[PDB]
């Protein structure tokens, strides 16, 4: 018979993968007595963050294991790549690979691990948005590395690749669209917004629709992990372990934006944002109280 042409949202059609070994799951299983907040969080699909702790020599196997496990679960894995050189401009989440050559080798290995398997990839939270901390030449290098990630990862046809694009109160839509266009967003599925932040979904839809229009109709995802109460009052460090924040909409493709492929939990609720001027836990360390606070503040 006839073969139809292609129609669609790559994120629609199977559930997002719940990592069975996340820090939240470990905490939920250990809670004595059981805790409603922790269990809820642990059972919500999030994203699996990879960085320079996973060397190029071995990260391919790590990626293949994770994507293969998700496939065995009938689910879409979400992976967050967070290895850019000069990561976080040397602030609380400092890290990343030492050099661009190492980063390129890492990307090559990630792509090898992906093969042809389904995956959603969030490329480098903050890298484009924060790039002005770098000199002109290191900024250009960074853009070239993000472009390298797009060009290399998209060789997995089943990888839905979203380049991180900051949020609605970071760069302007015009400034961020220019960076996304420079790194080849047209070859990706699109971009991500609100990662590790707290802005309302509605505000992020308006911003994402604007960037989409400036990037030839690209699509986007919004991190709704911690945005159920919107942001804390405008202040320095209001993004760094703020109190009073709530879990947002659980991950879904039933979104309210014309080009919004999904609401995802990209940040993992419970992880510290950093020491934050208060001696709080190192960035990325899981704090059960933080996950419980987010769930309590959402009324759970």
CATH number at residue 234: 3.20.20.40
Sheet holding 119-123, edge to edge: 48-50, 78-81, 119-123, 159-164, 190-193, 219-223, 260-264
Local structure of 251: helix, strand or coil: coil
Residue 105: how many CB atoms within 10 A of its CB?
16
| Within-domain flag for 5 | no
Nearest Cα to Cα of residue 71 among 140, 126, 136, 16? 16
Residue with tokens 């890290």: 95
Question: What is the number of alpha carbons within 13 Å of residue 46 lying toward its C-beta?
Answer: 26
Q: Which two tokens stand for residue 49?
A: 């963050």
| Within-domain flag for 58 | yes
| Within-domain flag for 7 | no
Distance, CA of 162 to chain centre: 8
Q: Which two tokens stand for residue 39?
A: 């269990």
Distance CA 231, CA 187 (A): 32
| Within-domain flag for 91 | yes
Distance CA 129, CA 191 (A): 12
DSSP states of 145-196: HHHHHHHHHTTSTTEEEEEE---TTSS-HHHHHHHHHHTTGGGSSEEEE-TT
Distance, CA of 28 to chain centre: 23
User: At 261, which helix (H) or strand (E)?
Assistant: strand 260-264
| Within-domain flag for 6 | no
| Within-domain flag for 9 | no
Provide the β-strand partners of residue 221.
Answer: 192, 262
| Within-domain flag for 2 | no
Q: Which two tokens stand for residue 251?
A: 């991950």
Q: Which two tokens stand for residue 296?
A: 């309590």
Residue 243: how many CB atoms within 10 A of its CB?
8
For 67, the domain range is 15-300
Angle between helices 136-153 and 100-114 (to 10 degrees): 10
- Please list the active-site residues: 88, 126, 273
| Within-domain flag for 126 | yes
The angle formed by the CA atoms of residues 155, 156 and 160, to the nearest 5 degrees, is 110
Domain count, the chain: 1
Distance CA 212, CA 230 (A): 23
């Amino acid at each position: 018979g006839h073969i139809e042409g292609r129609h669609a949202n790559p994120l629609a059609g199977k559930p997002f993968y719940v990592d069975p070994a996340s820090a939240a799951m470990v905490a939920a299983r250990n809670a004595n007595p059981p805790n409603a907040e922790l269990t809820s969080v642990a059972n919500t699909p999030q994203s699996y963050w990879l960085d320079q702790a996973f060397p190029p020599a071995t990260v391919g196997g790590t990626v293949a294991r994770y994507t293969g496990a998700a496939q065995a679960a009938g689910a879409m894995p979400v992976l967050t790549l967070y290895g850019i050189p000069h990561r976080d401009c040397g602030s609380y989440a400092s890290g990343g690979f030492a050099t661009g050559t190492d980063y390129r080798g890492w990307i090559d290995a990630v792509a090898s691990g992906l093969g042809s398997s389904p995956a959603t990839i969030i490329v480098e939270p903050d890298a484009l948005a924060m790039a002005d901390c770098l000199s002109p030449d290191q900024r250009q290098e960074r853009f070239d590395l993000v472009r390298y990630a797009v060009d290399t990862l998209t060789r997995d046809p089943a990888a839905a690749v979203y380049v991180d694009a900051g949020h609605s109160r970071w760069l302007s839509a015009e400034a961020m669209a220019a960076r996304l266009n420079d790194v080849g967003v047209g070859r990706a599925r699109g971009f991500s917004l609100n990662v590790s932040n707290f802005y309302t979904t509605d505000e992020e839809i308006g911003y994402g629709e604007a960037i989409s229009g400036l990037t030839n109709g690209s699509h986007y995802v919004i991190d709704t992990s911690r945005n159920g109460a919107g942001p804390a009052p405008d202040a320095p460090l209001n993004w760094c372990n703020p109190s009073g924040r709530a879990l947002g909409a659980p991950p879904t493709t039933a979104t309210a934006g014309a080009h919004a492929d999904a609401y995802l939990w990209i940040k993992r609720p419970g992880e510290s944002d950093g020491t934050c001027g208060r001696g709080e836990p190192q960035a990325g360390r899981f704090v059960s109280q933080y996950a419980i606070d987010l769930a309590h503040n959402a009324g759970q």
